[PDB]
């Protein structure tokens, strides 16, 4: 036999507080037992950035003629490896694999010890220098023990496989395949070898076989190129039809195999056109898909291969055919699944936000680019290599004196990296992701890669949705020879927030759906936009509710929207997967019904809604959605798209009416038109309502807008789940009224000052109830602090048919109010 | 009069603070918190470090309060665990001992007149030998884990210094259908330097519009004085009687006035009932024999520690009411007023106790602290009509097996004499409620006569779980009834544990499957329902709850809940609902399962066997599969059951054809062919499936290899201490503990008659502790056993791993997941063999996946 590879994940010990573990040390008290993948930042997300030590003892008797390697799939950010007390290898860069040769350091006794010093603290010379994703530290990807013979495919070529496959000619009826081999001989004698190259669909069928003789001098290495000309009878690879092959490579000495290594192969040719976009195998197709971050709360980035497959499966069932690996190279499993499932892939190294001037940052960046290209060279799913994302974002934060020099270093580094891609891989495109900032225009940076990618957020971070088409049409107009691609577009959503009046940045489900519908449509309407990737597949941990699915991978409405917009299978399903409750405060004493707007995601011409299995109405689908306006009797109801479906269970909903004249047998989110449904105890906070005589609601005031967006987006201190309640508010309300019957009520007022910072004597006011003084003075900025919530809870007894009148008494500045709850209690 | 507002906002917390007594403006290194708060919400979970922080934590806060002439200001702490020292503007202002009862702190002597105030609280949840709970099966969460209130009164007021009680104590010494007497005992205080002539108004009310009785009493208190005054409302008419079924509630409004102006006011609950416990027939209330059936409830909710909202208390008790419960035991400690108000309003008879668990410390300091805690519980919760039982010890002899022999005699006498003193105090403080004690299956109670001291003998019993078989429960209790015809018997605890990811067609005790819990619960409940001398039973426990020292399937969590930690009902909850509810009940089981996977037992197999059950109190019910009738089943003891054999695919289940108001249950059903192609995951050593929710990965129960198929070859399933598998915490993993914990010992290997191809293969293996132990969480480092369990692994004659020293290179409880790819050729199938060197190989799980290369 030839090459052996097993997992090396088990039996490790970890400590965040060890000073030095280089020398063999049997101590384990105080160390944490871990099984890789591991990150030490899975829970503390500031989060700990620093040194962490791993150590392990293991048994391995070195046999004659064998070589032993460790392959680390990923250590963030730098690693130093020590075997039996001796330095054995180091690596810089948290996103690419590396190999360590154990053989020089093994004990003949078989008793081995290894330690790894990992460090994820900031280094000016190692990107990512800053970004809005977490830099989880540790050995967060698996580790493998590899045994080979002393003649083997190289282990020292930037962590790549040492086997590099190229298809310089591909037609439907034949192709040329060239395979470039890096071979190493570790023995002290010259050696004569044979190299068997087989192109296979599977173990029983081969499409081409080649046999190559090679002789290597003692301690030698050599590069040999093998060509399979005019291969035939293959299927072409495309996202739609991802026909996959592989190259079996057997290195033999004396007819006995001494190494072996299979690599993927797909047959395809492709190009990008400025007017019509992406063509693969002569066919024009729209690339629509998603970015995907390699993290999942509460596990950090220490993900199982099962999790990788689940993610990419979700993308494929969405109808996606396009995958951007966020800002870094990802696990082999991810690329294997893309080959297998059918995604065209954009992969980049993590030069994000900013650049460090100088040759150390240049060198580390160059090495990382070569590692990515070499390590993922053979994946047919990859069509784009990139190397900078939003590289000017941090200009706003830098001293203006540095800006000229940073632009010069950015231009110079981009040209070096562009040149390296084009030399290492002439058969893929280069790209860069830019964003809505004038520095790209002004420096001409977008002229350097083959593809101009734009991260655009019109209607979310700036402007309105239609400004997206305006922006892209103007780019196409200025640059009719560029290839345009939307590398990021998306809006956020909290699956507890719902509004019949969604608005920019409110984080409601409906707002994300409308954003996603508009931009995707505007992309579909434009052939010159080669494609688009939603930011982001799933909610992730950042600095982040931007996913089409939740952190634990459950689809939101927007996911089903994209499935209706993208899938070729027929699609028709109800929206609101995370909502089952509707509550409506009556707008007049004669109200008896709850208004319920329902929607479905479909690619059919029309769809019909059934209530309790009786037809409600047929509705026309436009841009992936159908919609019905229902007025329902309060109670439970079943919704469905067919009557008495034989295979689809109905959706159960619960709709309630609050009477116009309340009795408190009353929860309101002030300052916002969305409901907040608190999942801990099923507590439904209503959208705001102004008080009117005979009813209940807030009196006076203005809704808070900050930077032109509703409410504050700052983190509300001291509470986790209730931030969307506190973040919206009325400024300068006179109070709150409710025409309650006589009785005793528990009353809650939620209040917070918006941008620990203390601002005394700035915002002070009193609260009274029916002339009774409750809190003579609340100093929100002073005694609590900016972003520190204040929850005033108390009981009051309404007497003499007075109703309930809560009054604010300004002392300094203006009162604020974020939410109100009123409950009837017995006493 | 009286003003009360929440005081929960604006606090700062630090676990690393030496001392914050003196007013100090810095906030660097402090966490902003909103009470309720505990610092043990996260470090009690599976965080890689057994144990949690018990020690000092400091809180501080600045606040505005301008003291008004003629006002007093108090803080009321609803609970701080375990001790609290309060400092206002640098001065000691109060301290409390005990983590489960409220306390008041008078702010007034320490307030700055100009209004800018500083407060710091030093809290501590270290172990203290003189302060129970000393040890227990629950977590001692530290901090101010219940709300704090700012209370303003006049200078004459209902006392704030009577063991934290309201200073208003309502008793109904006579309750009759045609009339009742209510006596209200008031403790008053005068902080004025002058004597005061006061009036006191006492009104019994249904609501603000309706008075049942009214009294007006003149009280004069001396300067700086205090007094107790008793008010009697005789022959109150026109009330409705309180019972769990009909919880008619009233309250006593009390106003204290000085020259007609209100200086204090405080309402308190009031319900009218009479009740008794009978040795032969059980509980009677208002003349009607009713069976008390309900649950224990702990005050925690993972992952929030015990820092719960009042919304969460209401949700817990509403769940119990919807289960058909009419009986609540507050686990081992007094709970929040909200719990008790909701018991009054919803209708549960309540048992409440102080946390003397497992053991007693000899000495007057322990005696004193437990005495105070008893007075605090009874006084603070005195007025709640829902309380019918007070208690003060729980399995008080449990820890004896672990104590030094020379301590036992004095521990036994300390226990006996403390139980007598606490019993005496209850009877003196509250003649109108019963005393009880929870005992467990241990002969100590019989030897000492401790069970003769309370009026009610409670048993925590676990037949078919910890000892014996289910039917030994009725034998145990019948013998108790025969031996003690004068006692009152009540099952204060019974339950079994379940993980909602574990399922078996062959349930067995301690596999933690859902089905075993349902079967345990069904058997003991109906045995209780058959015995009128058993006045009642409380399930252990309403919800899965934090108990950090636990191991088993899910470390740190006691999984005996009827509902999960986030309050979702398991099967056993719906079983209890079917056994207890008066409303009609009929509903499908398996709320946490939608997948069934079956390995074909022969090449002709085409159908997946699916056993379905439903919970009902009807005579029979009908199962419908894809809305066609499958079959009508008779209901026996709350359950109907059906044996289906279904074609692989998605199917609908329902109890009515095309229900107009109930969505069907959708299930997903799959058959692994007799001969596999790996397009295959097995829990070795166990008859239960493990459904890993992170990724919906379903590990089949074990199946022995036979020619032409796949499975484990040789070996014996591991049993330790009478329980399947090992119950130790499997290190380095969390979700997969129940997968690793079961295994075959000395297997030859594994086989799969797979087609030619490349396959990814995973073998999961762990060296185990050979002898069970009481507490498996105190290991200081890893236990290595080199040279004891050594073997090699080959596949089809190819050497994969020349030697693995499981005990030596990994260690006891350290998982080893061996993952690799192998290419099957030459029609050979897949043959994985172990090669013993020392000791025997082990194997907990196998997974095989076809890959392309
Ligand atoms: Ca139906
Ligand atoms: Ca927050
Ligand atoms: Ca811990
Ligand atoms: Ca574990
Ligand atoms: Na708000
Ligand atoms: Na197992």
CSV table of C-alpha atoms in Angstrom, one decimal, chain A residues 1 4-13 26 28-35 56-60 111 144-145 201-203 244-246 262-265 296 298-299 304-307 309-310 333 336-337 340 552 554 612-613 636-638 644-652 679-683 717-719 721-722 726 742-744 746 748 756 758 773-777 779 782-784 788-795 797-798 821 823-824 826-827, chain B residues 3-12 25 27 30-34 47-49 61-64 66 68 116 149-150 206-208 249-251 267-270 301 304 309-312 314-315 338 341 566 568 626-627 650 652 658-666 693-697 731-733 735-736 740 756-758 760 762 780-784 799-803 805 808-810 814-821 823-825 847 849 852-853:
chain,number,residue,atom,x,y,z
A,1,UNK,CA,0.0,0.0,0.0
A,4,UNK,CA,-2.4,6.4,4.6
A,5,UNK,CA,-4.4,9.3,6.1
A,6,UNK,CA,-6.3,9.2,9.4
A,7,UNK,CA,-7.9,11.9,11.7
A,8,UNK,CA,-5.7,13.3,14.4
A,9,UNK,CA,-8.4,15.2,16.2
A,10,UNK,CA,-8.7,13.3,19.5
A,11,UNK,CA,-6.8,13.4,22.7
A,12,UNK,CA,-5.7,17.0,22.9
A,13,UNK,CA,-5.4,19.2,25.9
A,26,UNK,CA,2.5,14.9,31.5
A,28,UNK,CA,-3.1,17.7,32.7
A,29,UNK,CA,-4.6,19.2,35.9
A,30,UNK,CA,-6.1,22.6,34.9
A,31,UNK,CA,-6.0,21.7,31.2
A,32,UNK,CA,-9.2,21.3,29.2
A,33,UNK,CA,-9.7,18.1,27.3
A,34,UNK,CA,-10.7,19.0,23.7
A,35,UNK,CA,-11.5,17.2,20.5
A,56,UNK,CA,-1.1,15.8,23.1
A,57,UNK,CA,0.8,12.5,23.6
A,58,UNK,CA,0.4,9.8,21.1
A,59,UNK,CA,2.0,6.4,20.1
A,60,UNK,CA,3.6,6.0,16.7
A,111,UNK,CA,6.3,7.6,22.7
A,144,UNK,CA,-4.7,14.6,9.9
A,145,UNK,CA,-1.9,12.2,10.3
A,201,UNK,CA,-15.6,8.4,-13.2
A,202,UNK,CA,-15.5,5.6,-10.6
A,203,UNK,CA,-13.4,2.6,-9.6
A,244,UNK,CA,-17.7,14.9,-11.7
A,245,UNK,CA,-14.6,12.8,-12.4
A,246,UNK,CA,-11.3,12.4,-10.6
A,262,UNK,CA,-6.8,11.3,-5.9
A,263,UNK,CA,-7.9,14.8,-7.0
A,264,UNK,CA,-11.2,16.1,-8.5
A,265,UNK,CA,-11.7,16.9,-12.1
A,296,UNK,CA,-22.4,28.7,13.5
A,298,UNK,CA,-22.8,28.7,19.6
A,299,UNK,CA,-19.9,26.7,18.1
A,304,UNK,CA,-18.2,19.6,11.6
A,305,UNK,CA,-18.1,18.5,8.0
A,306,UNK,CA,-21.8,17.5,8.6
A,307,UNK,CA,-22.5,21.2,9.2
A,309,UNK,CA,-22.8,19.8,4.0
A,310,UNK,CA,-26.0,21.0,5.6
A,333,UNK,CA,-15.4,19.8,2.3
A,336,UNK,CA,-16.0,19.2,-2.6
A,337,UNK,CA,-19.7,19.9,-1.9
A,340,UNK,CA,-20.7,17.8,-6.3
A,552,UNK,CA,-29.3,27.2,13.7
A,554,UNK,CA,-33.9,27.4,10.0
A,612,UNK,CA,-60.0,26.1,7.7
A,613,UNK,CA,-59.9,24.3,4.4
A,636,UNK,CA,-57.5,29.7,15.9
A,637,UNK,CA,-57.5,29.0,12.2
A,638,UNK,CA,-55.9,26.7,9.7
A,644,UNK,CA,-57.5,19.1,2.9
A,645,UNK,CA,-54.0,18.5,1.5
A,646,UNK,CA,-53.1,14.8,1.5
A,647,UNK,CA,-49.4,15.5,2.3
A,648,UNK,CA,-49.0,19.0,3.7
A,649,UNK,CA,-50.1,19.8,7.2
A,650,UNK,CA,-51.8,23.2,7.6
A,651,UNK,CA,-50.3,26.2,9.3
A,652,UNK,CA,-52.1,26.9,12.6
A,679,UNK,CA,-40.2,34.0,22.3
A,680,UNK,CA,-39.3,33.3,25.9
A,681,UNK,CA,-42.9,33.4,27.2
A,682,UNK,CA,-44.9,34.2,24.1
A,683,UNK,CA,-45.4,37.9,25.0
A,717,UNK,CA,-26.7,47.3,27.8
A,718,UNK,CA,-27.8,44.9,30.5
A,719,UNK,CA,-30.6,43.2,28.4
A,721,UNK,CA,-33.6,39.8,24.3
A,722,UNK,CA,-35.4,43.1,24.5
A,726,UNK,CA,-35.8,49.7,23.9
A,742,UNK,CA,-61.7,50.9,38.3
A,743,UNK,CA,-59.3,48.4,39.7
A,744,UNK,CA,-55.6,47.6,40.3
A,746,UNK,CA,-49.4,46.5,37.2
A,748,UNK,CA,-44.4,49.1,33.3
A,756,UNK,CA,-20.4,53.6,30.4
A,758,UNK,CA,-22.9,59.3,32.0
A,773,UNK,CA,-46.3,61.4,41.9
A,774,UNK,CA,-44.6,58.1,41.2
A,775,UNK,CA,-41.0,58.9,40.5
A,776,UNK,CA,-40.2,62.5,41.3
A,777,UNK,CA,-37.2,62.4,39.0
A,779,UNK,CA,-32.1,61.0,35.5
A,782,UNK,CA,-27.1,60.6,34.9
A,783,UNK,CA,-28.0,57.8,37.2
A,784,UNK,CA,-28.3,55.0,34.6
A,788,UNK,CA,-28.5,51.7,30.1
A,789,UNK,CA,-32.2,50.7,30.2
A,790,UNK,CA,-34.6,51.8,33.0
A,791,UNK,CA,-37.7,49.6,33.6
A,792,UNK,CA,-40.1,51.4,36.0
A,793,UNK,CA,-42.6,48.7,37.3
A,794,UNK,CA,-45.3,49.5,39.9
A,795,UNK,CA,-48.9,48.9,40.8
A,797,UNK,CA,-55.4,51.4,41.8
A,798,UNK,CA,-57.7,53.3,39.5
A,821,UNK,CA,-47.3,47.3,29.5
A,823,UNK,CA,-51.8,44.2,33.4
A,824,UNK,CA,-54.9,43.9,35.5
A,826,UNK,CA,-56.3,41.5,41.8
A,827,UNK,CA,-54.6,43.9,44.3
B,3,UNK,CA,-45.3,53.7,47.3
B,4,UNK,CA,-43.4,50.7,45.8
B,5,UNK,CA,-41.4,50.8,42.6
B,6,UNK,CA,-39.0,48.3,41.1
B,7,UNK,CA,-35.3,49.0,41.8
B,8,UNK,CA,-33.8,46.7,39.2
B,9,UNK,CA,-32.1,49.1,36.8
B,10,UNK,CA,-28.7,50.8,36.8
B,11,UNK,CA,-26.7,48.3,38.7
B,12,UNK,CA,-23.0,47.4,38.1
B,25,UNK,CA,-17.5,56.5,40.4
B,27,UNK,CA,-17.0,51.7,35.9
B,30,UNK,CA,-17.7,46.4,35.8
B,31,UNK,CA,-20.7,44.8,34.0
B,32,UNK,CA,-23.9,46.7,33.7
B,33,UNK,CA,-26.8,44.5,34.8
B,34,UNK,CA,-30.5,44.7,35.2
B,47,UNK,CA,-18.4,24.7,29.5
B,48,UNK,CA,-15.4,22.4,29.6
B,49,UNK,CA,-14.8,23.1,33.3
B,61,UNK,CA,-25.4,51.6,41.9
B,62,UNK,CA,-25.8,55.3,42.1
B,63,UNK,CA,-29.3,56.7,42.3
B,64,UNK,CA,-31.3,59.8,42.9
B,66,UNK,CA,-34.3,63.2,47.8
B,68,UNK,CA,-38.9,63.9,52.1
B,116,UNK,CA,-27.2,61.7,45.3
B,149,UNK,CA,-38.1,47.2,45.3
B,150,UNK,CA,-37.9,50.7,46.6
B,206,UNK,CA,-63.8,40.9,46.3
B,207,UNK,CA,-62.7,44.0,44.4
B,208,UNK,CA,-62.5,47.8,44.7
B,249,UNK,CA,-60.1,34.9,45.9
B,250,UNK,CA,-60.5,37.9,48.1
B,251,UNK,CA,-58.1,40.3,49.8
B,267,UNK,CA,-53.3,44.7,50.6
B,268,UNK,CA,-52.9,41.0,51.3
B,269,UNK,CA,-54.5,37.9,49.8
B,270,UNK,CA,-57.4,36.0,51.5
B,301,UNK,CA,-34.6,28.0,33.6
B,304,UNK,CA,-30.8,31.9,32.5
B,309,UNK,CA,-38.9,37.0,35.2
B,310,UNK,CA,-42.4,37.0,36.8
B,311,UNK,CA,-43.6,36.2,33.2
B,312,UNK,CA,-41.6,32.9,33.5
B,314,UNK,CA,-46.6,32.5,35.4
B,315,UNK,CA,-45.8,30.4,32.4
B,338,UNK,CA,-45.5,35.6,42.1
B,341,UNK,CA,-50.1,34.5,43.9
B,566,UNK,CA,-37.3,26.0,27.6
B,568,UNK,CA,-41.8,22.4,25.8
B,626,UNK,CA,-52.6,10.1,5.2
B,627,UNK,CA,-56.3,10.7,6.2
B,650,UNK,CA,-43.3,11.2,4.2
B,652,UNK,CA,-49.4,12.3,7.8
B,658,UNK,CA,-59.2,15.7,7.5
B,659,UNK,CA,-59.5,17.5,10.7
B,660,UNK,CA,-60.8,21.1,10.2
B,661,UNK,CA,-58.9,22.5,13.3
B,662,UNK,CA,-55.8,20.3,13.9
B,663,UNK,CA,-52.8,20.1,11.6
B,664,UNK,CA,-51.7,16.5,11.1
B,665,UNK,CA,-48.3,15.3,12.4
B,666,UNK,CA,-45.9,14.9,9.5
B,693,UNK,CA,-30.5,17.6,16.3
B,694,UNK,CA,-27.5,19.9,15.3
B,695,UNK,CA,-27.6,18.3,11.8
B,696,UNK,CA,-30.6,15.8,11.9
B,697,UNK,CA,-28.1,12.8,12.0
B,731,UNK,CA,-14.9,14.6,28.0
B,732,UNK,CA,-14.4,17.1,25.1
B,733,UNK,CA,-17.8,16.4,23.7
B,735,UNK,CA,-24.1,16.5,22.4
B,736,UNK,CA,-22.6,13.1,21.7
B,740,UNK,CA,-20.1,7.4,23.3
B,756,UNK,CA,-16.8,-1.5,-4.7
B,757,UNK,CA,-16.2,2.2,-4.0
B,758,UNK,CA,-14.6,4.6,-1.7
B,760,UNK,CA,-15.5,7.5,4.7
B,762,UNK,CA,-15.7,6.6,11.4
B,780,UNK,CA,-8.2,16.5,38.8
B,781,UNK,CA,-6.9,15.9,35.3
B,782,UNK,CA,-7.2,12.9,33.1
B,783,UNK,CA,-6.7,9.3,34.3
B,784,UNK,CA,-4.3,7.5,32.0
B,799,UNK,CA,-3.4,-2.0,8.4
B,800,UNK,CA,-5.1,1.3,9.2
B,801,UNK,CA,-3.8,2.0,12.7
B,802,UNK,CA,-0.8,-0.2,13.7
B,803,UNK,CA,-1.6,0.3,17.4
B,805,UNK,CA,-3.3,2.7,23.3
B,808,UNK,CA,-2.6,5.5,27.5
B,809,UNK,CA,-2.8,8.0,24.7
B,810,UNK,CA,-6.3,9.3,25.3
B,814,UNK,CA,-11.6,10.8,26.5
B,815,UNK,CA,-13.3,10.2,23.2
B,816,UNK,CA,-11.4,8.8,20.2
B,817,UNK,CA,-13.1,9.3,16.8
B,818,UNK,CA,-11.1,7.5,14.1
B,819,UNK,CA,-12.0,8.8,10.7
B,820,UNK,CA,-10.5,7.7,7.4
B,821,UNK,CA,-11.3,6.7,3.8
B,823,UNK,CA,-11.5,2.1,-1.3
B,824,UNK,CA,-13.2,-1.3,-1.6
B,825,UNK,CA,-12.1,-3.4,-4.6
B,847,UNK,CA,-20.7,5.5,10.6
B,849,UNK,CA,-20.5,7.1,4.0
B,852,UNK,CA,-16.6,9.9,-4.7
B,853,UNK,CA,-12.9,9.4,-3.9
